DNA sequence: GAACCTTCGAGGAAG
DNA sequence: CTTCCTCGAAGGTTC
């Protein structure tokens, strides 16, 4: 899962986000076994 | 609220409003969602006006936002996250997006998708996003500023234009009947025809009148208090500000129609070069009262009989 | 005080003075606030002075800011939700504020709504019903949809002589100081039309009655005390006549280059085009040329010399 | 002291001497600030030094600073904020405060307040900032630099005007007492009358001079050792400097006195065009040597009988 | 050494050099700092020399800088912080300073003081910085773009000029003795006269007469070989390029001598129309080749000499 | 897609197309990269789509940028870098790249190698990037304002032209079968006759088309129906648009049909120069309804009689 | 690689080579560098060549980078930091580099040091840089668009023509020689001619020929396949570019011929002015297709026999 | 009518 | 984003 979790973070950094605010907003994220889409379009929903 | 809500009320701008009844309802026709629309103009012919209705008469919910507030990229995806099925994105301004977001949009109009590519090259893959579809509406004062790339995945072109006397008049007939006031026709046609072609000028105009109407009058606009009104406020026939008429008259009585500079043309009137270039001027030039020189500002002829002066080549 | 606090007071301005009356009455009568209020035009003509009487007149509080203080967007923000119903705001020098702050006043004027990003998250704060008033001494600096949304503008004029003469009259009573009639008059002509030049020109007046005389003005100590000051009865000051004097003189009224005429007096090109000038303009004494500037006749009348074609 | 401290020590001046003298004493019958006072003018002339001397005769303190200094908004604010009652408050140079920064003092100046930004986030602020009662002093070259509406707040206006003969030959003597020189009577007034006008320029030359006076002489100046000196310099007893001289004599004697051009004149003197027109001509045109045309450059009849050719 | 670096090896500049030894000799009788000196006149005469011999003769180190490289205020202040008890500071090319530091000196070179504005930000306060005895050496080759109080702060004027044959003969032969070439005494005065009374000039003719007569010759400059070299680079016995013998030979045997107007000119030599007055003219009308009049100009008779045309 | 991907599927551009197939043809028997190639013309005619044929035709993958998008040399550097031998790089208004990014071009298109200063403060060093072969394809609207030494790298031009009715025939056919609409040979003649001869042009009124006739018809685009939509669009018959219209009415009307330069006329309607310079006036032009003069452009009787305004 | 490397293989400017190889060979007797050299004249003549050449001939690296290149002072001081002890650094364009950073060579070029204010904050001081020996060499296109005193302190100076018909059939033969081609002389004289006298369009020519000759032809060079390849290219039977057709058909059709300026000109063919005149005019010029007069350019009647006009 | 000189006005580039 | 300034035009005089 640390592909998914790294590669949301890494998504979500991708598109302009801080690497430590990105972290903490995927890290936010209770379900670590989403995949990788719904993990960054969760994220992404949740910051606005 | 004085903003009509759909086709029906929207006075004026048949032109682009023709185009767009035909292009909607062949949406409709379909399952798809409209193409992607462009409007261009100047300030306040009701662009933003028009944006609702589109909405409304898509019968679909609508998210508002403007360029300037749209700092990083994230803000575009997250946004367009929210979006159901079909919903209008409008954008303000958007010729004032900064350009790293642009080379985004460019996927979301183009395949409604994103994709997003990591590492080094020697071991990469991609992360892809899908979104619902959308249509992406933007407002512009500026066209030419735009992008070849962006402006080619635009499909609808709306150039609004200024109102004319008969349907400017009906703006004001309709807002007078918003508040308690009764107007002739006649009188709603002098506001009309020193509004200036905008809508929001009129508005304003019209809320003058009824104050000195309802305090120096019956309450009622009439034909004559109409003329006592716009006697108070120098507005003139042709819409000419007091310092308008002041502007031509000094070119024509102390310059024989220049040139002249705006320099010594400020100092005669005691007005600060900004205000001149930028309050008065633009309008002059626009009803073809006055031209520029590589020597300076000229009147032309058409000038000199609206002032009432005779001319001479 | 110096400054006057109701229209009753306010001398002058009877164009910007009688609508103001109209609107503000209208106001009232449907217990409404004022539209947005734009208030342009010459320095030192009345600006603040007017901004202060449409508060007492509405009889509201005024809260007061000025658009150097305000450096960001959060800087308004925190102005604006301290608004109660019914508050006016006055901006001063708003022509200073910065780009980023001026598209948050667009919304709140027409759309009494401003939405502002602020752990990241938007909230919507909904203002209640307001008067926004401004003045300004460059009105084309600020952008055009912001002129678009004030739904009143009052360019300021100058004064004539009945009126300063009332002026002068008024500020001696508040300085307790005795002055004729005509002794006033004096005064008046000499202010460029200006009220705070008139009050300036008082108080130094002031200072020379106290030492060189009794503690009173009269048209013997006032032909006094301006012959000091060397202020002309038409108000020209000692390089105001300078210039004159060099054209009429040396290059027999012109044209002369704006160059050439800063040489020979020994000032600086800036100044004379930007401090003499303009007064000389207006009254008609130069006429600015293709060639240069000429002298008109009206200058060769007051010099006292033979005008020749 | 090289700087007088009081008006019975500043020479010249009547017109601008006379009126402070009348404002201030006005001023302490009513024991209140003085009025905010501009100096303007050419350099040289004594804006500085009357600074000093209002502030002396007012008998406060003077706070002093400049222009070049004050890069900010938060650096007004705090000096304004450091001011006690009856201060006075000294600007050299006030031409080069940013525009942004002069807004803040209109309503200072007027109304004795400013309107600063406090707290944060829903804690931030405007308030009032109340000064209490100061002069304000500024002194500039290019007064029409100065905003209109700030330009208009001063009460007093003092514009300078250059000195006379008898009173650049009274300084001379003056500065001939600071150090220790003894000098007749008819040298002072040779050097005066080769000062352009200018205080400052009067004491370069005696400067110059005591150096001579010293190396080449007894160190006592007298008419012999004062002409030998002003020989060396290649000072004409009007003033003119040696390029001076050689500009008028090709005007004379290549042109017949014109009209020509300055470019045409700057070549032959191998100058170049900017020394020329902002160093040379301009003393040249205000004492009547040369005068302006639409053709060019001319020669007056004054400038003939100078250099000793004939007026033809 | 190329650059003299005492006024015994300077030769020229008697004007300039008479009066700077009077003063420095003054100036250590009383122990004190020589006043500030300004250096100005036409490219290449020996300006920057000339500073470094003022700080040999003061006997003091000498701290240097120039105009482009101080930037911003806070540069000038840093400078300025450095400075010891009779420091001399030489600051090249000054008239490249910005406006806003250009204004910092004004205090400082007759005060010794400057304002400064220090603090944490919340607390701050404008204090005095004051400097020990300094002089101020400035160079230039435009003095017209310096402000006018600024100009009348610098207490000595040098003003350059251009040097005559038997000086300039002196500067090829000492140079000669650097490079170890042996010259003959008639090629000193050749190279001179073809060095348009600069310095700059005749040591770059040498240097590259120098380079031929040891590639293609015995090693000693001699009367025959000089004359082969400058055939070379092409340079007239006037010094005059082939551009030059081109604008005297149209103008003779294409109209008579004139009057032409400059662009008619101009075109019929193919060259641009500013570069002409500016890059080629100049020398030629300082020299009298060409002289210039209301309806155009004119070659004068020694033009026609120097040609081999016949005057009429 | 809509656009060819092959030489045998790209119509027109005989003479681009004719010359670009024996280049590519020779590179592969010589097995070397193609020369660097630029592309230059109106906008939409196709310029983007030559370079992906021409990358088909090489067989090598095509990267793709713009002139905006490259804002620092290290931009260019990493693109440059992220290259694999006989890769095709497509820059699209190379024209607008700063000065700064162009330093790295030349080095690289002349011979495949970079220098790269790195470092700051006591760090200040380069960097030597060795660049595996490459080719260089550029596109531009505007040819004249390419900088001078940059033009002269690129060793292939192609300039791009208007197409004629005979093949914007059967591309409108071509598309119409992409999108599977059924159109007359009538019909798609007059979409044609009126696309302005741009393919661009002539998509989008195909798009539009259908949703009209899928109103005011049963989905079939008559010829009839066709001219219809096209009125409703407020396409002129020839072609002109709502800016063209306006554009000769307002000369027509207000300036006597001109002469009018390219600056006033775009002041009085909202529209930029450079668009009405870049894609109004070049067909407006060749199509004879504005003519060129010494002080402007003027109205052809051509224009007044299609408009419907009584000729001069 | 096709770039000559040493004076035997440059071929033609005999000239420049000559004066080069004196002062080179002399410079190598002594252990030092070479004088600075500014070479001027058109553009693509071989210039950059030249700086290759004299760097392998004095046997050190050459460093290269342009006028428009560099910035700010910072630039300058990392790039002259980078230098080995007898390095040559080539500018190209260096009359384009901004006035502040020109006036930092200044001391770089005659002393071999730098003074520049180093850290910030506390930290700021001045440091004076010691330079190691090095030789600049610039490039421009004429002598009088630098200033007097940059151009005052180059000690050599070159002017570079164009190549005459005998030296260009030798450089494409020899460019033939490289490629394993074979061409006949008919051919390579024919190619020459056409080459508008430069030898970088020469072997842009010759490749392009190549490709065809080897796809079209049988891989020999013939004067019909010199013809072919050139006509189906818009290289006229005279070297004329399509801008140069452009420009004559402009003046005649647009102005009757002239006379008109360039200024006005350039506008209406939408060229920068800069590239008319530094690469079309001369050559228009030079060879009596554009003739000069005082009111502005003339066509000459063989710019109307060759467009095939009427000289009326 | 060819040539010089002064003056103003509007761009644009260097802070 | 602003000041500074330079480039282009044109009015007037003289031989
Ligand atoms: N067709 C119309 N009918 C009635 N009112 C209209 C119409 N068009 C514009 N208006 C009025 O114009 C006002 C301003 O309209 P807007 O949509 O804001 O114009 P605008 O183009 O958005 O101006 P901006 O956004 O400042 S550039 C509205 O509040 C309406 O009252
Ligand atoms: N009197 C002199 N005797 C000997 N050499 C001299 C003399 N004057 C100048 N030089 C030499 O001339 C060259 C240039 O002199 P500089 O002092 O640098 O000229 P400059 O005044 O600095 O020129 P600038 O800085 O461009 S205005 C140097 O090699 C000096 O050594
Ligand atoms: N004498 C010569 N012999 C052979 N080839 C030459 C000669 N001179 C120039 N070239 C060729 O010219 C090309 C390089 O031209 P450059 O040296 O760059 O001229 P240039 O002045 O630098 O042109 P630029 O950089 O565009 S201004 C190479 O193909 C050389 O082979
Ligand atoms: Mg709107
Ligand atoms: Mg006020
Ligand atoms: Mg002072
Ligand atoms: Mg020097
Ligand atoms: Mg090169």
């Known amino acids: 899962s640390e592909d998914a979790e790294q590669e949301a973070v890494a998504a979500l950094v991708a598109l302009g986000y801080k690497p430590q605010e990105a972290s903490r907003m995927v890290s936010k994220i209770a379900r670590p076994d989403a995949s990788s889409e719904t993990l960054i379009r969760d994220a992404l929903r949740a910051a606005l | ?313």
Do not use: C, W
């Open chain 2, 1 to 313: 609220t004085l903003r009509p809500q759909y086709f029906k009320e929207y006075i004026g701008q048949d032109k682009v409003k023709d185009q767009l009844k035909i292009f909607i309802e062949a949406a409709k026709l379909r399952d798809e969602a409209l193409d992607h629309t462009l409007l261009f103009g100047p300030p306040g012919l009701g662009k933003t006006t028009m944006a609702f209705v589109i909405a409304n008469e898509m019968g679909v919910n609508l998210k508002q936002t403007s360029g300037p507030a749209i700092e990083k990229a994230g803000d575009l995806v997250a946004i367009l996250n929210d979006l159901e099925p079909g919903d209008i994105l409008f954008i303000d301004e958007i010729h004032r997006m900064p350009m790293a977001v642009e080379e985004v949009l460019y996927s979301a109009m183009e395949d409604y998708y994103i994709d997003i590519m990591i590492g080094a090259g020697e071991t990469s893959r991609s992360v892809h996003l899908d979104l619902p579809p959308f249509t992406l509406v933007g407002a512009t004062t500026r066209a030419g500023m735009l992008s070849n790339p962006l402006r080619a995945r635009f499909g609808i072109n709306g150039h609004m234009e200024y109102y004319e006397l008969p349907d400017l008049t009906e703006i004001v007939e309709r807002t007078s009947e918003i508040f308690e006031m009764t107007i002739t026709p006649e009188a709603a046609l002098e506001l009309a025809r020193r509004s200036r072609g905008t809508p929001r000028i009129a508005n304003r105009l019209l809320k003058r009148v009824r104050d000195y109407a309802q305090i120096m009058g019956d309450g009622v606009i009439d034909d004559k208090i109409a003329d006592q009104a716009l006697t108070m406020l120098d507005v003139d026939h042709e819409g000419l500000d007091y310092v308008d008429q002041k502007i031509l008259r000094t070119m024509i009585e102390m310059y024989g129609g220049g040139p002249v500079g705006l320099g010594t043309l400020s100092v005669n009137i005691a007005e600060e070069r900004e205000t001149v270039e930028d309050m008065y001027e633009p309008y002059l030039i626009q009803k073809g009262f006055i031209m520029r020189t590589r020597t300076g500002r000229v009147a032309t002829a058409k000038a000199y009989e609206h002032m009432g002066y005779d001319y001479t080549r």
